[PDB]
C-alpha cells in the first residue's frame, strides 16, 4: 500500500530490476551492499544512497624487457589470523 517513494526523478533501470530512491553516479568504488549484475549501493556524502558499477581494484601495470630484473632488498614479517569451526 506504500507509494511514497514513487515521486520520481530518482529512477534508474538495472538488469536485476529497477532501483528507486537512489541516485546514479559515474564513478567506481569498492561496494559493500550487493544488488545484482555489477550494480552496488553505498552511503556517501546531506548524505544519500548512491549506486555505481563495482570496481575490480586499482590498475597496476608492470615493466617487461629482455634485460630487466627485480631483486628485493628488504623484508617485513606479518602475522595473520584464520578462524575455522
Amino acid at each position: 500500500t506504500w507509494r511514497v517513494y514513487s515521486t520520481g526523478s530518482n529512477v534508474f533501470q538495472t538488469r536485476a530490476g529497477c532501483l528507486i530512491g537512489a541516485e546514479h553516479v559515474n564513478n567506481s568504488y569498492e561496494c559493500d551492499i550487493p544488488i545484482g549484475a555489477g550494480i552496488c549501493a553505498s552511503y556517501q556524502t546531506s548524505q544519500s544512497i548512491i549506486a555505481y558499477t563495482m570496481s575490480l581494484g586499482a590498475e597496476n601495470s608492470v615493466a617487461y624487457s629482455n634485460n630487466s630484473i627485480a631483486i628485493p632488498t628488504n623484508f617485513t614479517i606479518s602475522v595473520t589470523t584464520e578462524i575455522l569451526p
Binding site: I69, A70, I71, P72, I77, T80, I83, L84
Partner: protein
C-alpha cells in the same frame, strides 16, 4: 626480526579487542542452532486443521468417536516438523565435518611442520604457525615472510669468458652498469663471480642473449706465492 615479531602480535591484541566482526564464522554456528530449536517449539501452537491446539482441549470436550479424528490431524502435523528438523541438522553436520578435516589438516602441516603449498598456511612464504583455543572452533596465527622494497637491475642468462659458457648455480646475474655479480632471488647480496658459483657447459654460440665478462680464478694469488 625479533622486533618485528613482537610488534606483530601486539597488533592482534588491539584488533581482537576493538571489534567483534572477526569471529563471524563462529557466530553463525550458534545462531543457526538457536533459530532451529526456536522454530521447533513454536509449531506446537498451530492447529494443522484440527479444532484446537491443546491435546487436553480436545480430550476434555469431545467424544472418543470424534477424538481419534482431531488427534490424527495433530500427530501428522507434528511429525513433519520433526522430520524437517532432523534432516536439516543432518546436512549441517556435513558442513562441520568438512571444516573439522580441514582444521586437522592444517594442524599437521602448518603447525607440526612447514608446508611448501602456496596460499595454504597464509599469504606468502610460511615460516611458523601457533594454534589457539576458541569456543567451538580453532584460531591459527600464521607467521609469514613478505618482501617489501624492490630495486631494478640489468640481468643476463649466462656468460662466457674464454669460449666456455658459464651458467649460474644458485641465483641469477645482476649488473649495476659497470660490473656483474651473483645474487639470490629473495635477497640482494652482491658477490664476485668465481668457479664455486658457476657451472660450465659447452660453448657460448648457442645461448641467446649472452654477454661477455671475466670469471675470477681463486688459484691466482696462491700459486704465485
Amino acid at each position: 626480526i625479533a622486533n618485528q615479531f613482537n610488534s606483530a602480535i601486539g597488533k592482534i591484541q588491539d584488533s581482537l579487542s576493538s571489534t567483534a566482526s572477526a569471529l563471524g564464522k563462529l557466530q553463525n554456528v550458534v545462531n543457526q542452532n538457536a533459530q532451529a530449536l526456536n522454530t521447533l517449539v513454536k509449531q506446537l501452537s498451530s492447529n494443522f486443521g484440527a479444532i484446537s491446539s491443546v491435546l487436553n482441549d480436545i480430550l476434555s470436550r469431545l467424544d472418543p468417536p470424534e477424538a481419534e479424528v482431531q488427534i490424527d490431524r495433530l500427530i501428522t502435523g507434528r511429525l513433519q516438523s520433526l522430520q524437517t528438523y532432523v534432516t536439516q541438522q543432518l546436512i549441517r553436520a556435513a558442513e562441520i565435518r568438512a571444516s573439522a578435516n580441514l582444521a586437522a589438516t592444517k594442524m599437521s602441516e602448518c603447525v607440526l611442520g612447514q608446508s611448501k603449498r602456496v596460499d595454504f598456511c597464509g599469504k606468502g612464504y610460511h615460516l611458523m604457525s601457533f594454534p589457539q583455543s576458541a569456543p567451538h572452533g580453532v584460531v591459527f596465527l600464521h607467521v609469514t615472510y613478505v618482501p617489501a622494497q624492490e630495486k631494478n637491475f640489468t640481468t643476463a642468462p649466462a656468460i662466457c669468458h674464454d669460449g666456455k659458457a658459464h651458467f649460474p648455480r644458485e641465483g641469477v646475474f645482476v649488473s649495476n652498469g659497470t660490473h656483474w655479480f651473483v645474487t639470490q632471488r629473495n635477497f640482494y647480496e652482491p658477490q664476485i663471480i668465481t668457479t664455486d658459483n658457476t657451472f660450465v657447459s659447452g660453448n657460448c654460440d648457442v645461448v641467446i642473449g649472452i654477454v661477455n665478462n671475466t670469471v675470477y680464478d681463486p688459484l691466482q694469488p696462491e700459486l704465485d706465492s
